[PDB]
Amino acid sequence: RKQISVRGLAGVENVTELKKNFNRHLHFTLVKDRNVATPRDYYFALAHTVRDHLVGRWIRTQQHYYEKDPKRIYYLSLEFYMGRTLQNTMVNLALENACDEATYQLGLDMEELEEIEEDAGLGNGGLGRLAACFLDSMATLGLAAYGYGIRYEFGIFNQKICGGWQMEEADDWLRYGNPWEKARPEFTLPVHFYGRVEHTSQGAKWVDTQVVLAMPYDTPVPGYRNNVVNTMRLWSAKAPNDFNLKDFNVGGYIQAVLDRNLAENISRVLYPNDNFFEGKELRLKQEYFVVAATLQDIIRRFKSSKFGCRDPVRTNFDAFPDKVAIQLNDTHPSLAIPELMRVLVDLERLDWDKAWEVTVKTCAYTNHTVIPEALERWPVHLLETLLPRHLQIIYEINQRFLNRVAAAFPGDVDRLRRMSLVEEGAVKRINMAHLCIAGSHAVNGVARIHSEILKKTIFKDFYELEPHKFQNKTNGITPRRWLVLCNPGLAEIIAERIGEEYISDLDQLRKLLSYVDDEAFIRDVAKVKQENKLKFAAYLEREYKVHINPNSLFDVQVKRIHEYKRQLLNCLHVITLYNRIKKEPNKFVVPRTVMIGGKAAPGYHMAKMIIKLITAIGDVVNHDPVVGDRLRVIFLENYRVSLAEKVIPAADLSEQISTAGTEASGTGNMKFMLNGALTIGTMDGANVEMAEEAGEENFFIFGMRVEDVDRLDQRGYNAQEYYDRIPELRQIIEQLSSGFFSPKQPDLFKDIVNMLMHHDRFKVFADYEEYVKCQERVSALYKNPREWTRMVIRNIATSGKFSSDRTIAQYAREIWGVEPSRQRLPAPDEKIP
Amino acid sequence: RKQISVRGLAGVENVTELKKNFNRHLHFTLVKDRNVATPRDYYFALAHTVRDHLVGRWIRTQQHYYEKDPKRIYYLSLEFYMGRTLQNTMVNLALENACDEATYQLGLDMEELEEIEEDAGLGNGGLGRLAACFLDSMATLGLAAYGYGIRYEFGIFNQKICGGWQMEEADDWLRYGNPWEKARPEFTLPVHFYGRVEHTSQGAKWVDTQVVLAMPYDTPVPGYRNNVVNTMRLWSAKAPNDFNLKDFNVGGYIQAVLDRNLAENISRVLYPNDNFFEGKELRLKQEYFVVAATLQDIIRRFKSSKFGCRDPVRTNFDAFPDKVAIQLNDTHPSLAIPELMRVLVDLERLDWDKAWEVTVKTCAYTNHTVIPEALERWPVHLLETLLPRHLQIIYEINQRFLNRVAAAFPGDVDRLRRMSLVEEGAVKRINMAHLCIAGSHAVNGVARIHSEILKKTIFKDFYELEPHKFQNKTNGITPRRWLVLCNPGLAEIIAERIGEEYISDLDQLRKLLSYVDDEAFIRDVAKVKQENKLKFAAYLEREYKVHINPNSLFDVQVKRIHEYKRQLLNCLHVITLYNRIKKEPNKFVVPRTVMIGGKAAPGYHMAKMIIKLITAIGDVVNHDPVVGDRLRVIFLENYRVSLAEKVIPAADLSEQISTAGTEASGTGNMKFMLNGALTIGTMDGANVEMAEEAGEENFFIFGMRVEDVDRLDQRGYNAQEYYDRIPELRQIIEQLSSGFFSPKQPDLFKDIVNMLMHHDRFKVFADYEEYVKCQERVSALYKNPREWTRMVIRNIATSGKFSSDRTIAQYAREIWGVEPSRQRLPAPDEKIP
Ligand SMILES: O=P(O)(O)O[C@H]1O[C@H](CO)[C@@H](O)[C@H](O)[C@H]1F
Ligand SMILES: O=P(O)(O)O[C@H]1O[C@H](CO)[C@@H](O)[C@H](O)[C@H]1F
Numbered sequence A, B: 001r002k003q004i005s006v007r008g009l010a011g012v013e014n015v016t017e018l019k020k021n022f023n024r025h026l027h028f029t030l031v032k033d034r035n036v037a038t039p040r041d042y043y044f045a046l047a048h049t050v051r052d053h054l055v056g057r058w059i060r061t062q063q064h065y066y067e068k069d070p071k072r073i074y075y076l077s078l079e080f081y082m083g084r085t086l087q088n089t090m091v092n093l094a095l096e097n098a099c100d101e102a103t104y105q106l107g108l109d110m111e112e113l114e115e116i117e118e119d120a121g122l123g124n125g126g127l128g129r130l131a132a133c134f135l136d137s138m139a140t141l142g143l144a145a146y147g148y149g150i151r152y153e154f155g156i157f158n159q160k161i162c163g164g165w166q167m168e169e170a171d172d173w174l175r176y177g178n179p180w181e182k183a184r185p186e187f188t189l190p191v192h193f194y195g196r197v198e199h200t201s202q203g204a205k206w207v208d209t210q211v212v213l214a215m216p217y218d219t220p221v222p223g224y225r226n227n228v229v230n231t232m233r234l235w236s237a238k239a240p241n242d243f244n245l246k247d248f249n250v251g252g253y254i255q256a257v258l259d260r261n262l263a264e265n266i267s268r269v270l271y272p273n274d275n276f277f278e279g280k281e282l283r284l285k286q287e288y289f290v291v292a293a294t295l296q297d298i299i300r301r302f303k304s305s306k307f308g309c310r311d312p313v314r315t316n317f318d319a320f321p322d323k324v325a326i327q328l329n330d331t332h333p334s335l336a337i338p339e340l341m342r343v344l345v346d347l348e349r350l351d352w353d354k355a356w357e358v359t360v361k362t363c364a365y366t367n368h369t370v371i372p373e374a375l376e377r378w379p380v381h382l383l384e385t386l387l388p389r390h391l392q393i394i395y396e397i398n399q400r401f402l403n404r405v406a407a408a409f410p411g412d413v414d415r416l417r418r419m420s421l422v423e424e425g426a427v428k429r430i431n432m433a434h435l436c437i438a439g440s441h442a443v444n445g446v447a448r449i450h451s452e453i454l455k456k457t458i459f460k461d462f463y464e465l466e467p468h469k470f471q472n473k474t475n476g477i478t479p480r481r482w483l484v485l486c487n488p489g490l491a492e493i494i495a496e497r498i499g500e501e502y503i504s505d506l507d508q509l510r511k512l513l514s515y516v517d518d519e520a521f522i523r524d525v526a527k528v529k530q531e532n533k534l535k536f537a538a539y540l541e542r543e544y545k546v547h548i549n550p551n552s553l554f555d556v557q558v559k560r561i562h563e564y565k566r567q568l569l570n571c572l573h574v575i576t577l578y579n580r581i582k583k584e585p586n587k588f589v590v591p592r593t594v595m596i597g598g599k600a601a602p603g604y605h606m607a608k609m610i611i612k613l614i615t616a617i618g619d620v621v622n623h624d625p626v627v628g629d630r631l632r633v634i635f636l637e638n639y640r641v642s643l644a645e646k647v648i649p650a651a652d653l654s655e656q657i658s659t660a661g662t663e664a665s666g667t668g669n670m671k672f673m674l675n676g677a678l679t680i681g682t683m684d685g686a687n688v689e690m691a692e693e694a695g696e697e698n699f700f701i702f703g704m705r706v707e708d709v710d711r712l713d714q715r716g717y718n719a720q721e722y723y724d725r726i727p728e729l730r731q732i733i734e735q736l737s738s739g740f741f742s743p744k745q746p747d748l749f750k751d752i753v754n755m756l757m758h759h760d761r762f763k764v765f766a767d768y769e770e771y772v773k774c775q776e777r778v779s780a781l782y783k784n785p786r787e788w789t790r791m792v793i794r795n796i797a798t799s800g801k802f803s804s805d806r807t808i809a810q811y812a813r814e815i816w817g818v819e820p821s822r823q824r825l826p827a828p829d830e831k832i833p
């Protein structure tokens, strides 16, 4: 509708400078002219003009670290969920408004162009977005840090609903090019697979391996206004030229060339699984490929440091942990550990015992879940085929580890079979989480209950052996994408009262408590939320047609579709609402638009069945005339980072409904608290610290706490007891069973009825009473608007703890051994030396 | 050593302008700085700075044709052998010297950087290089012409000799990027495969096809100093997103994504075959893919022309031949013909008879060979699986064609089975050359004997039916790469006497005859050749170590290794030389370095065996002490366009030794005549017109003429008769048979002895006597240096006929119906309208 905001300055020389460079790239880069360029060409000409302001800083940030030679952080992760990069690069560079002006002054709309950029979807959900929020905070806090991963050609599938069913399609995100990466084929590295170990004379050598080459592509990562631009280096697999061709004595020339994309398949696609584990060979190859190439880049930069000069010299790998820290994001890069040992013992010739002290002191592991099927336990026959030397290192690590255990707990022979990194069973497997705790100096959970559960349940044997290792670092979100850029309106009215230093010191939001009774602030906070609701209701109407009423409670659950996340308990509530107004049509109920969005992993039949229940409820509710506009259900197609930047500011109610003790943290819950939505949720993961921060009175907690879940499981969850005692619940089960929601095919949901009734791992019926109760308490508050906005002002003013600048300042300090900083690096300026 | 030349002007503002843009791209494009850039970064910064001068001209040449709307030429070819693009773009743009200066003034050497560029090897030999010389001449003659083909990821294999054997390896030419193409993914098109024909109500429809998408990449093609920059558009195969993913009911998500490079395999690799024919499905798919996508681009530009406005209107495809001409380079794009019919009949709804008159008037075919196994005769079961509608069009074309034949030659029933486009036999096949003659309005050979042979032998039935169709257009070479850029020294001393207008009017070289007796010109011509010999002898010593004597006759044969090209007859001569000085060690013989280079198709066992004989002769000769430096044999590794630009200026003797009547033209023979080498050759292909142009006295013709070859075949070639009568020949056969040239393994060459003796298709022994005779006559002339240079001045001064500007001005005028031009298009300048 309008804006000016403090998206920086649009200064005279700079709007002019930009327009010129925009017209340059349209001509020289795009080789398009004004009468034939489309909005996409206009998008790339701006994308190149904005990366031009970034390269000078990138060049000097990288030479600056070469000169001062910090300890460098390597965040290894198999997922990095970046989303779009234009607006965020403008935010961090102070260019939002000058490019806005310049674009207006050239006849275009920035927002049109910004919507043309495709999302880099290299992540599934939470862990991958966490990696992306960390890179932002590591650059903003001036750390010499590098994100490393795989440059996947096809990120997470684009979801389409066809006839209410998920239909998945390839995310060919590079179809049109990527203006942000810089291929660096001169730095390609080999990564070896298969092979043998020959033991001769002095050590093992891994021989007759097949070679795949790792080609890197660097994406710049600019901090918020401090002239630090760090590097995300993503590897692409490339077939060699000789082996992937010469080995001869007939087998087709053309075939040998066509078979190269077989080795180049290691980076073809992101594995699409939220909280599960696929024991597939392609996957372990992707995991070894990023570990292998990354560790060669690490050692390379260490060998220069300044030791490649002196410092001491006589290759004292002794200082390797005082120059490198590698952060294992989950067990996906756990081969960082036998691979660092392999180079150090086999190739570099240190003794096992020096090389183990160097490995544990440089590695650290972040654990992201408790659910047992997410755990990676790779079968031994896979590792001995593919990586025979690393299996051999893992059996000697295992050996020496359990000799410490038995020395520490003598006679405790079941502990020994429980701590082992080798799981006997039909299929003997390697427990990768165990590897990680054994060869890392610090282990951490992503929220205070999650970290307490690890010590108390899942890794108690390991805590008793090395208590000092276990740590907690509650997750965070970046105030730059998740507030300044998806919600410029809410950021200006905060910046009007308290200024802008909160964008890199989010704890300042607390100074907003003073305005909880300021009627100018209550109306502005309330005007921003209604604005966002109108802009999203229009988006809905435009891009997807649907039309919803902007004057309802916008009830939204957006996250991957998993049973533990409980989209089914939300469904049970909307069917209740439906039925309470079918019995009393003429009772006023507060009207709500309830929006559920998220992706189902492709062969997870329950998740795909839950998307078909949600679109089935919307087919009834959205077409009943007695309901009118009072209730609508909307399934939010193709949830991804850029859609989250649209919906979360338009949210009034955030659904954070997991069975207590299953969500390790969640970070979507945080994004929704900085953007003026209220939380209804169980005491799970970080919802606990969030309510502790806003006060439980300012939060709508319901349900079973974890204690209660353990009592229910000692007792035995019988779901028939909830059916027998709750008539509103009896009735829903029977409407699902008789085809009410699937007329033409009545039995269609009996998979879901049989499950809820007989195999509910996540106790949906047990939290049902307390949850429709709690849901009556939020509707009661919504219809007294000024007391809703005051509860909202108490949530927003208490979001500070949940910034990734705090989480990363705590990894920096208590795990990596670096001090953060905000002192801006010298101004971008010229000087070619 | 030195140069200045007239490689254009290095003017004050321009050397400055260039240095600046070089430093810009190193920083902003390369994101490298001065202390860390390698010669490759320096190469790309210049490559981008030179394409910046090209885009303004390209943009305005393409909008200029949209405004005047010429008849446009489409040169469809499956091969385009471009070589490197930097120096040639500098030549044609007048930038050679300013960039030379600027680079010197920035501390680098241009020649170092220019050697870093990888050759675009999208061709096998002659036909592919012809396409590349034509594009240059079509732009220089200001024609609105477009080269169309496949953007192959892997061009022709890089050859390596290991132990004297060819070893082939992938040409991953895009490893480092290509600064010259511009991807245009917004213009992707579908190309359909497989399917069915349903006949309903009004016509056939091709239904249930699989879809592959064609992504184009445009390379600019600048004419020699006329501000026309035309377009080579090369298609890349891309899998669709929905079909290459959705078709469901289980078959793996990850698999569906990995299987996309199966459809993207259509442009993965160039088929590596010189003069043979592979009936492989991948190949017909590449042939349909370029026809399909090209014809959609053709029709698109025709539908705008100005008819998409009016001109008349009521879609009078009537004017389609007065606006389009498509040139079939060989039968590889022959499906241009049932595909143009298919769109016009099926999709566009014209009657068969209007659509056939429009097809023949727009298509024309260039025939490139006579050897029967080069002929494409695709088996019917392939075409009915893959392209069922086009087979159906080819059977109705066939039908109506033979009804004309039978009407014209009534009762002549064997003519009917000979002209048929459908070859009955065990495997019924379609004769694609026949398709081409039936649906083209003009057919041509590539040299006056080759064109006479078509009328007289291979297509006599077709000439008697439509005599008016057959034409000749002798091949040419471009004076810009093949003289101005590989031989700047020879071009300045010509330009010193006669000026520079000869570079686009090569017939002016005749004014050099006046200097055949000018002792200043004889010494300069002779100094340039000795310079080139020293620069190549150093190259040899550097890049490949070898060391040859620059004071010998440099005897060179460079071309693909085929039996008809007769590398074996040259080998028989060098073994003779060897043996004549083994019998008389102390006779002075004129010393020669004989260099044979060329690639063997991978499973052509004779060609691979001929490369092993040549490296085997060099192992003896090059290590005999009695020979001294008097004779050396050098196998020239990885012959390709950029190596041809090195060797051909260093050549004294050109070997053009094919059995008369087998080489259709040859164009290497021409390149060698403009660069001061003398030809020893048979009366074959264009060697006939070349000797007719220089006078037979100035040429060293030997051997059997085609008449004589027919008499020998009527009689019966018995090779034992030549063995019995020629002792020097008896002796070589026995040295090959007894392991003289393969000691450790004696029988190693008996494949080649058995062949020469019993299965010689190309009569090597019959031309042996006359050829060692003729070879004694060139050594006699070499040792009287001033009379060699005068014969050389008479060859160089008579090269004019062999320019592709003359060949293309004759296609323009007598086949396409366009007038050439040299009037430079307006100066590059700015103006964004
Ligand atoms: O991989 P390293 O060497 O750390 O970093 C690489 O990329 C940076 C960023 O442009 C260059 O400054 C550096 O010289 C290059 F080698
Ligand atoms: O990546 P997904 O599985 O969505 O998310 C996982 O990791 C994130 C980030 O630590 C946690 O918040 C979440 O509790 C867990 F389930």
Ligand SMILES: O=P(O)(O)O[C@H]1O[C@H](CO)[C@@H](O)[C@H](O)[C@H]1F
Pocket: A031, A032, A036, B058, B059, B062, B063, B301
């Ligand atoms: O394929 P056509 O349209 O002929 O040509 C295409 O590329 C040229 C060269 O930049 C543009 O001027 C033109 O507008 C575009 F559409």
Ligand SMILES: O=P(O)(O)O[C@H]1O[C@H](CO)[C@@H](O)[C@H](O)[C@H]1F
Pocket: B124, B125, B126, B127, B128, B130, B274, B275, B368, B369, B446, B475, B560, B663, B664, B665, B666, B667, B685
């Ligand atoms: O492409 P290759 O097979 O080398 O060459 C073929 O076509 C060229 C170009 O017309 C002819 O000169 C040659 O005689 C023929 F054999």
Ligand SMILES: *Cc1c(COP(=O)(O)O)cnc(C)c1O
Pocket: A124, A125, A126, A129, A558, A559, A560, A639, A640, A641, A642, A644, A665, A666, A667, A668, A669, A671
């Ligand atoms: C933040 C984010 C997530 C995480 O959501 P949770 O509710 O914590 O599971 C998932 N997907 C996207 C697109 C995100 O923005």
Ligand SMILES: *Cc1c(COP(=O)(O)O)cnc(C)c1O
Pocket: B124, B125, B126, B129, B558, B559, B560, B639, B640, B641, B642, B644, B665, B666, B667, B668, B669, B671
């Ligand atoms: C000119 C050229 C050819 C053609 O040589 P011929 O002797 O005509 O067969 C083949 N390869 C390259 C690299 C060329 O330059």
